[PDB]
Amino acid sequence: GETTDGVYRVMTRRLLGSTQVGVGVMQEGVFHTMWHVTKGAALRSGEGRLDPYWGDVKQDLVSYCGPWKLDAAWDGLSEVQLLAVPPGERAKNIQTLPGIFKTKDGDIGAVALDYPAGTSGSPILDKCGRVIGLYGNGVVIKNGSYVSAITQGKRE
Amino acid sequence: DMYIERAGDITWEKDAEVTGNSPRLDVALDESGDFSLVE
Ligand SMILES: Cc1ccc(S(=O)(=O)CNC(=O)[C@H](Nc2ccc3c(c2)CNC3)c2cc(Cl)cc3[nH]ncc23)cc1
Numbered sequence: 445g446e447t448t449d450g451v452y453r454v455m456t457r458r459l460l461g462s463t464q465v466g467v468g469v470m471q472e473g474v475f476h477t478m479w480h481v482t483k484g485a486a487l488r489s490g491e492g493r494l495d496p497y498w499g500d501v502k503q504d505l506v507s508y509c510g511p512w513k514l515d516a517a518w519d520g521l522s523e524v525q526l527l528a529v530p531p532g533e534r535a536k537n538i539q540t541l542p543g544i545f546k547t548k549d550g551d552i553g554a555v556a557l558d559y560p561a562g563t564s565g566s567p568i569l570d571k572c573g574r575v576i577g578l579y580g581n582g583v584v585i586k587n588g589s590y591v592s593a594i595t596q597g598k599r600e
Numbered sequence: 601d602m603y604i605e606r607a608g609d610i611t612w613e614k615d616a617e618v619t620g621n622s623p624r625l626d627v628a629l630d631e632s633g634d635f636s637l638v639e
Contacts, residue, residue, distance in 0.1 A: 445604075446604070446606060448606065449609075449610070450606055450607070450608055450609050450610055451606075451607050451608050451609075451610055452604040452605060452606055452607055453604065453605045453607050454602055454603075454604055455602065455603050455604070455605060456601070456602050456603075457601065457603075458601065465602065467607070468604065469610065470604075471610075475604065479633065480633070482602060485602060486602075487602050487603065487604055488601060488602065488603040488604070489603065489604050490603075494604070501631075501632065501633045502629070502631060502632075502633045503633065504633040523618075525612055525613065525616060527608070527610060529607045529608070534607075534608075535607045535608035536617075537612070537613035537616040537617075538616060538617055538618075538619060538620070539613075539616045539617065539618045539619075540618065540619060540620035540622075541620070541622045542622055543621070543622035543623040543624055543625065544622075544623075544624045544625070545625055545627045545635070546624065546625065546626050546627065547627055547628065547629060548628070549629075554622075554623070554625065555620065556620045556621050556622065556623060557619070557620045567610055569610065569611075569612055570612075571612055572612070573610055573611050573612045575610060581633065581635065582635055583625070583627060583635045583636065583637055585623070585625070585637065586637075591623060591625060593627075593635065
């Protein structure tokens with residue numbers, strides 16, 4: 445099937461009509477998405493099949509066809525772009541300055557942008573267009589808004 | 601059964617809509633991969 449680099453929608457014909465369950469990044473022949481989007485199940489790309497290769501529920505990440513390729517990281521200082529791909533809507537770049545998730549194991553960047561659950565897996569970019577993480581795993585703050593972590597995997 | 605559809609190139613767009621605040625939150629991450637606000 446299609447192995448061209450770029451952002452993709454993860455769809456399902458298991459519910460009413462075609463439903464967008466998430467988003468993913470195709471890079472170096474490897475599809476990268478969030479674990480809660482596919483639950484580790486196989487994906488289809490036209491005629492071809494994509495089989496899971498690596499996955500981890502705690503990191504909430506999964507890769508298809510090969511090991512995790514995305515290794516860029518937020519510099520802690522500059523603005524980033526969320527290439528948001530919302531259900532039924534065109535891909536759209538939203539520039540923002542990330543905040544911080546302070547944890548017992550370290551600090552992680554966070555993007556405070558609200559989008560439908562089907563936007564999970566949309567990439568976060570640096571000024572060079574490098575994927576510094578995926579949007580879609582976060583929390584709801586006391587005012588009801590959504591703040592997502594900048595979730596990045598490890599490249600072996 | 602899930603399938604993928606291309607939605608675009610991964611490129612930085614100069615003059616994109618700048619929005620969103622940058623909050624500093626105390627969070628915890630559990631074994632199920634779910635975040636929670638620590639208070
Ligand atoms: C009723 C309820 C309770 C809690 C929340 S939350 O604040 O924790 C939002 N959680 C998400 O990050 C979620 N994705 C998700 C789903 C399952 C799992 C994982 C992550 C990782 N482990 C399993 C998501 C992402 C996005 Cl982009 C838009 C969204 N809207 N609602 C959800 C949600 C929201 C709602």
